[PDB]
């Protein structure tokens, strides 16, 4: 058994009923590479804000 924390829960429903839950156990990096690009851009914009101060 591998144990750690639920970090993300997604729910989806359609006109054919529920698709169920997407559960992430532990800290996975975003599956779409473009969302990893946006995640790094958030980190830069916070650093670039403190460097201006």
């Amino acid at each position: 058994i591998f144990v750690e924390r639920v970090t993300k829960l997604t729910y989806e429903w359609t006109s054919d009923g529920p698709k169920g839950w997407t559960i992430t156990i532990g800290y996975k990096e975003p599956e779409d590479p473009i969302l990893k690009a946006f995640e790094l851009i958030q980190y830069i914009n916070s650093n670039l804000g403190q460097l201006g101060i």
């Binding site: 975003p30 779409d32 473009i34 969302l35 946006f38 995640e39 851009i41 958030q42």
Partner: peptide
Amino acid sequence: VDDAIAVKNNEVNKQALTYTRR
């Protein structure tokens, strides 16, 4: 095919609101 790429794009545009603001 191009419809599925359009659906995938709309899902990423929504998830990118976690990481962006105006």
